[PDB]
């Protein structure tokens, strides 16, 4: 008995086709994903194979103007139009609270929504009763398949589920729901969930009776072959786990942003044992046409969003240079503008202790994803800005020893010239690099804006002194190779969403004109 599992995860509100870098679509022929194209590929597989399930493993909520304006009404409408068979709750499904999960998603979705490890209590227990499920018995042809869902234990930190939900251990909560399906004479069982690849592997290993694991949260690309785009696989598709009972359990994920359709074909025997499994995420590129009905519907919802996305937030009278040839090689005015925004946002005074808690800002050149042109009568829109910052990182507050920041600035240029993203733009820092020195020894001047002073002025960094810095969450977690930051910092406090910070700054200043002014120099 043969099943075809189609799966998406972490689509993150990418309802329209994107660029290859999952931002806004400029050249039609180089564009990818979107529900209209996903509909085309799904219809075609459903016309070719008898036993097809379309599963989502959470994080449909949050990512574009779509989610901000329609608040998950768009998720219900366009997942309903695609006849998804089941969805597991992600952490971002709680971003507008359990209230904002119920009101559009759980009430308008025609498909089952699953989490075996989220328990409801208080007056929410009656209000949410039956709207999400521990497990689902799905008829597929003349057989049944059980689904059990699971959601990251960490959702109560990562999002806003409130006090009336309990996120219990996935393994402990999953096992009794799998046992229940076995007592209902269900011999084929899929764990569909949103805790990441490391947890997906442990579920496959430890939960007796799970045949297959379909996953999200870690944006993990698994591919068997020469990769068709820029995503480097963490391993082969599917990833086989030997369970403690000696079973081979396929584990799958499909990256993020609706760029790939996961595709897994399983042969089961009569008793529900997995005999064989093969597949590969399908790259959804311009060689699959957008379905014309879904596209016309997308266009309909688009009309009310065009107001919102071409909303003037402020004016620039300069070219905002966030091009990679500038921001990965030298000081760029886009970098200066984002760091000046970051410092403007984090304003706390104390009379005899400091002018500001924070004077200092770093940002990896790689994070800045677009320029903005000033010729559109100087207008900066949300869309324009979305293109610079497509990915909803937060700007966080860290404490670092001088020596740690010295090491970060060494890493910034350790392989200078090769268009890598680790090259730092700055505020409240003057740095000089000598590129003719050996890597680890190219920082010849590092001056920082004091805080323990009434008049802000520049002093040479001290190795044994502690500084407060605003930097992207990405750098805080050691992205682009900044392990010295992740491993050596002393405090981390999580801040506001990148685009929100840059947006309020532009709207408060009304007219910006950031210059390149010598924060970064070369001998």
């Amino acid at each position, epitope marked *: 008995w043969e099943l075809t599992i189609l799966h998406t995860n972490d689509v993150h509100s990418r309802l329209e086709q994107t660029s290859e870098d999952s931002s806004k679509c400029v050249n039609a022929s180089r564009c990818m994903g979107g529900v209209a194209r996903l509909f085309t590929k799904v219809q075609q597989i459903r016309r070719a194979e008898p036993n097809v399930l379309l599963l989502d493993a959470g994080d449909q909520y949050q990512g574009t103007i779509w989610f901000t304006v329609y608040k998950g009404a768009e998720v219900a409408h366009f997942m309903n139009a695609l006849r998804y068979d089941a969805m597991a709750l992600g952490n971002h499904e709680f971003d507008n609270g359990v209230e904002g999960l119920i009101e559009p998603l759980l009430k308008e979705a025609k498909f089952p929504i699953l989490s075996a490890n989220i328990k409801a*209590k208080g007056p929410l227990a009656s209000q949410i009763s039956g709207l999400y499920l521990p497990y689902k018995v799905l008829p597929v042809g003349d057989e049944v398949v059980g689904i059990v869902g699971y959601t990251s234990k960490e959702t109560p930190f990562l999002s*806003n589920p*409130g006090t009336n939900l309990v996120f219990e251990d996935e393994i402990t909560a999953l096992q009794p729901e799998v046992d229940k399906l076995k007592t209902l004479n269900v011999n084929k069982i899929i764990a569909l969930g949103h805790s990441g690849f490391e947890m997906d592997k442990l579920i496959a290993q430890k939960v007796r009776g799970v045949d297959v694991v379909v996953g999200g949260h870690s944006n993990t690309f698994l591919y068997t072959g020469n990769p068709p785009s820029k995503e480097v696989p963490a391993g082969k598709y599917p990833f086989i786990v030997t369970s403690d009972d000696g079973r081979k359990v396929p584990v799958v994920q499909a990256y993020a942003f609706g760029k790939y359709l996961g595709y897994l074909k399983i042969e089961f025997d009569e008793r529900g044992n997995v005999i064989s499994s093969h597949g590969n995420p399908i790259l959804l590129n311009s060689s699959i046409p957008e379905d014309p009905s879904i596209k016309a519907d997308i266009n309909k919802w688009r009309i009310k969003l065009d107001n919102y996305s071409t909303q003037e937030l402020g004016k620039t009278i300069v070219y905002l240079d966030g091009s990679s040839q500038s921001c990965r090689f030298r000081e760029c005015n886009m970098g200066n503008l984002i760091c000046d925004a970051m410092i403007n946002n984090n304003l706390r005074h104390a009379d005899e202790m400091f002018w500001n808690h924070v004077s200092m800002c770093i940002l990896n050149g790689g994070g800045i994803r677009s320029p903005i042109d000033e010729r559109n009568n100087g207008t900066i829109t949300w869309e324009n800005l979305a293109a610079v910052l497509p990915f909803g990182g937060t700007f966080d507050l860290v404490q670092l020893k001088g020596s740690t920041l010295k090491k970060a600035f060494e890493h910034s240029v350790h392989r200078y010239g090769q268009s890598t993203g680790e090259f730092l733009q700055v505020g409240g820092i003057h740095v000089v690099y000598d590129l003719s020195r050996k890597p680890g020894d190219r920082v010849v001047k590092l001056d920082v804006l004091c805080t323990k002073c009434r008049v802000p002025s520049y002093d040479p960094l001290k190795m044994d002194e502690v500084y407060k810095v605003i930097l992207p969450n990405f750098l805080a977690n050691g992205g682009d190779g900044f392990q010295m930051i992740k491993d050596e910092l002393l405090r981390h406090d999580s801040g506001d969403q990148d685009i929100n910070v840059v947006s309020t700054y532009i709207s408060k200043m009304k007219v910006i004109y950031p210059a390149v002014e010598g924060r970064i120099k070369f001998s």
Partner: antibody
Amino acid sequence: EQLQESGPGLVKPSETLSLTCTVSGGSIRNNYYNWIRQPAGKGLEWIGRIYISGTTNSNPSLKSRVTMSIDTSKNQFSLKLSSVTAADTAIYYCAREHYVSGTSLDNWGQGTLVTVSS
Amino acid sequence: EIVMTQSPTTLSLSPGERATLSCRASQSVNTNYFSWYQQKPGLTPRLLIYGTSTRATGIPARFSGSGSGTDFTLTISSLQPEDFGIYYCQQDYNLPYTFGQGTYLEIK
């Protein structure tokens, strides 16, 4: 309806800490049970929660140092805090959610003052 | 974590006047998860308001809880001597739970 915390008033730097909140009004219901602390003079700081079933979340500021426990045949909930420091001297409160809303902190204990010093 | 900036730090008004305390959250808080505490420097803090707006048992009608999104307000309309001490706003929408710096209210 009342919550008293058991656990001593004196701690060494680099050392343990057993605090045991006892409910005896009625019993541990289907609710989150909290620990909070306050540095003397300054403001309130949330430590962690535990549901009946044993599930626990704690403050990421303290994350590595907190363990918590619950027992319904006993009828209370414990706290443990590893590796203590000057900035940890503070009054330690147990508390539970308002039983209509399943929100807020309603029926607090007396508290216990703890001190780090040798 | 959601930062709770209460203002002012210290009010001094006369009995019979109106104390309007203001709490500003760095992120939007669903009104089901916003609450107000009274504390007398020393002893157990007592719940005033849960939801943004609901009085707890034993709390008089003087106390009007208000607000939504980012901006929450605690109005006390006719102040009396025993209304001395510290007042904290609280959110349990996101972990950690977080309390404000506190607002210090002396009767003139």
